[PDB]
């Protein structure tokens, strides 16, 4: 009746390690239960029990279900013991032991044992992660498709804006809000729909609000194009057309590239807090440090992304407390 807790290895994208770790943890804390976790650079080890959510991940490159953790010496014995399945397999090493001779070796151990070994068309992949004579052996559960993100990049969309948020970041920021399938995500300054697109694509109900008519219009054309069903409204993020505690997540990018600064961040901070449900989160993108305006929130994460010489984006994960 209960799912058990197993070790999973998340081989993260070095793009941003704070976003990569917080993304896996927010989703795991929501979909299941995290008995324990630990990280060393690009490797995140999770002790997890619950529904798998790996498909939603943007800043994770691979998820492996761990069978065992051993030394480089014990590798030969692990493979003589590791279960052999009725699927075409291959063994891939994500280590630093020069090259691929270890793969042929572990492949032959599996082969001598009766494994259906195919490196051209495998069905299952035995992953071995080497981080200084420490081997994380298991089976690959997820491998991120970098091609889907490159294809829905703002340049390729019916409509875009200068330096609009890239698919990978928008998805990571919707995931950081911890919003589930069928739950509502609000983007109060939605632009051409970068956040709304990933929200809808991962089966979350998207709501976009924008202060410019042609931008609301353009965002809809993009949503229709990506076969996405969501509502887009003309309104102000400083006076939102939604009731108190009506949204589970906010994911937004402020209009700095297109009253007063003190009014923009103050009125939006209070509106986001008003509109969001109890314990609800806001993943925001600014070009200046806005900490003082969001003291009504818990700053769970502040990271940065240098765009150009005149733009370093600040990325906050805020929570209602």
Resolution of this model in Å is 2.8
**Joined tokens for residue 141:** 């559960």
The dihedral built from the CA positions of residue 245, 19, 222 and 160, taken in this order, carries a sign that is: positive
Alpha-carbon distance 6 to 29, whole Å?
Answer: 15
**Buried/exposed code over 297-311 (b: 16+ C-beta within 10 A; e: otherwise):** beebbeeebeeeeee
Q: Is the dihedral of CA 316, 286, 198, 146 positive or negative?
A: negative
Q: Token digits for 152? A: 């829905």
Dist CA 288 CA 155 (whole Å):
26
Residue 166 DSSP class = P
> Which H or E element spans position 79?
helix 75-81
Report the length, in residues, of the chain: 321
Q: What does DSSP assign to residue 216?
A: H
Q: Quick one: which of 314, 296, 297 has its CA closest to 306?
A: 314
Find the helix packing angle between 17-31 and 167-176, rounded to 10°: 40
Q: 108: alpha, beta or left, given left = phi > 0 and alpha = psi -120 to 50?
A: alpha
Transcribe 232-300 into DSSP letters. Answer: EEE-BTTB-SS-TT-EEEEEEE-STT---HHHHHHHHHHHHHHHEEEEEEEEEEESS--GGGGTTEEEE
For residue 74, the SS3 value is coil
Contact 209, 190 (CB under 8 A): yes
Q: How many CA atoms lie within 13 A of 55 on its CB side?
A: 10
Alpha carbon distance 85, 103 (integer Å) = 18
| Method underlying the structure | X-ray
| Helix (H/G/I), strand (E/B), else coil: 5 | coil
Burial of 209 (0-12, 13-18, 19+ CB in 10 A): buried
Cα 127 to Cα 91, 107, 133, 139, 189, distances in angstroms: 6, 11, 15, 6, 42
Write the DSSP assignment of 115-153 as a string of letters: --B-SSS-SEEEEEEESSS-EEEEEEEEE--HHHHHHSS
Integer Cα distance of 82 and 126 in angstroms: 10
What is the pairing mode between strands 205-210 and 231-234? parallel
Return the domain boundaries, the chain. Answer: 1-70, 71-144, 157-321
**DSSP letter, residue 203:** T
Neighbouring C-beta atoms of residue 134, cutoff 10 Å = 14
Residue entry with tokens 């010496």: 73
């Amino acid at each position: 009746m209960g799912r058990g807790s197993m070790k999973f290895l998340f081989y993260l994208s070095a793009d941003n390690l704070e976003i990569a770790r917080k993304e896996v943890l927010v989703l795991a804390e929501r979909y299941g239960w995290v008995e324990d976790y630990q990280f060393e650079e690009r490797l995140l080890l999770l002790d997890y029990a619950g529904e798998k959510f790996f498909e939603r991940l943007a800043y994770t490159n691979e998820v492996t279900k761990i069978y065992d953790i051993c030394s480089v010496s014990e590798l030969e014995q692990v493979f003589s013991e590791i279960p052999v399945y009725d699927r075409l397999c291959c063994v891939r090493v994500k280590g630093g032991k020069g090259k691929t001779a270890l793969e042929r070796k572990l492949g032959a151990l599996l082969w001598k044992r009766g494994a259906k070994v195919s490196v051209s068309n495998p069905e299952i992949v035995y992953k071995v992660y080497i981080q200084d004579d420490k081997c994380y052996v298991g089976l690959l559960e997820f491998e991120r498709d970098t091609r889907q993100f490159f294809l829905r990049r703002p340049d390729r969309r019916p409509f875009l804006m200068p330096s609009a948020i890239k698919p990978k970041l928008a998805r990571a920021l919707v995931n950081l809000t911890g919003v589930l399938e069928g739950e509502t995500l609000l983007d109060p300054m939605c632009g051409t729909g970068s956040f709304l697109i990933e929200a809808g694509l991962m089966g979350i109900n998207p709501i976009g609000i924008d202060f410019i008519e042609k931008i609301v219009r353009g965002c809809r054309v993009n949503l229709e194009y990506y076969g996405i069903e969501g509502s887009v409204l003309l309104g102000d993020a400083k006076n939102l057309p939604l009731r108190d505690e009506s949204v589970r997540g906010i994911a937004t990018d402020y209009p700095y590239l297109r009253g007063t600064l003190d009014e923009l961040y103050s009125k939006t901070s209070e509106e986001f807090e008003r509109v969001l449900k109890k314990g609800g989160r806001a993943a925001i993108v600014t070009n200046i440090d806005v900490e003082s305006f969001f003291s009504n929130f818990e700053i769970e994460m502040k990271t940065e992304e240098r765009v150009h010489g005149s733009l370093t984006r600040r990325i906050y994960l805020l929570r209602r407390h």
